[PDB]
Structure formats: structure tokens, C-alpha cells
Amino acid sequence: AEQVSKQEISHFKLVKVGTINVSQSGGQISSPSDLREKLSELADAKGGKYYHIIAAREHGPNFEAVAEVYNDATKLEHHHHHH
Amino acid sequence: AEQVSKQEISHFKLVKVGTINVSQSGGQISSPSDLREKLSELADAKGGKYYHIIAAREHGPNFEAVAEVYNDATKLEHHHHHH
């Protein structure tokens, strides 16, 4: 999973699966490597291949990275419902 | 070189290394994968590890991808002025 700007998003046409928020109390995130690693983990959890951090804010000791998860246009009905 | 968000640049404090423009008449750039290696190339040439697309503008057949190069303070004055 990689992140792109609105320029790429609206040009290559990406679909949003959901919005992720990485809230880490203190030095749980040290470098951008940590940040992107958790971003991709959560983005991939949504099923998306792309993401974009809309709000990377510093809530005191707690770091909150809010990003939107974008998927490639290859998704359709997940017929499950229930048994 | 990776593309980071403007908030990341401002949160980690990245030094502005310069500007890189990919102005192609098509063919050279079709996928973001093409553009990435170009941007990373030009950024690496200037000596940056990060970049951000600030304007991916499509003017007819001429696609202009304007990104700016950012890197941490790992530069030094050179005693290689000329001789």
C-alpha cells in the first residue's frame, strides 16, 4: 500500500473503502517507517491498496494519523450475509 | 525516494532541496509507476530522499508533473568550488 495525493487520486480514479486512524500513545511510532507500516497494515485490513493521510496531528503524547484507504477498482459484492 | 504528505514534511521538518518537473508529451508516463521512478531519479540527482507532487497538471498531450524534493539535513558545504 502506497499513499498518493488528490492529484493522483482524482486522476487515476481511486475508490475509498474506509478511513483509518492510527492513534499511538507516545513513542509507539518513531520514524516514518513505523507510520507507513501501520498505515499499510490497516489499509490492507480494509482491503485497500492506496491511502492518503488527511490529518496527521500531534495530540500531546498521543500521535493520531488519520488517513483514507483507497482501493483499486476491482472490488464488488462480497456475498456472505450470514449462514 | 518516497512521496510523503505535506503534513509529514512539516512534522518531521524536511529541508527543501529543490523542484523537479516531469513534462512529457505522453508515452513516457502512463502509470504512476513510471512517474515514481522519474521523480525519485530527479530527486536523487539533487540529493533528496523524499518528494511531494504539488501539481500534476494535464495540459493537453503535455503532462506536467511538478514535485518538490525534500531531505533531512545531511548536506555539507563543498570545498570543491573549482580548484
What is the C-alpha separation between B8 and B72, in angstroms, rounded?
Answer: 12
Experimental technique, in short, is NMR
What is the C-alpha separation between A19 and A70, in angstroms, rounded?
Answer: 9
Please tell me the distance in Å from A43's CA to the nearest CA on chain B: 16
- Enclosing H/E stretch for A62: strand A62-71
3-state secondary structure of B34: helix
Domain boundary assignment for chain A: 1-83
Closest chain A CA to residue B7: A56
What is the C-alpha separation between A50 and A47, in angstroms, rounded?
Answer: 9
Check if CATH label 3.30.1660.10 holds for domain B1-83.
Answer: yes
CB contact, 8 Å: B8 with chain A? Answer: yes
CB-closest option in B4, B7, B56 to A8: B56
Kindly report the three-state secondary structure assignment for every residue of A36-51: HHHHHHHHHHHCCCEE
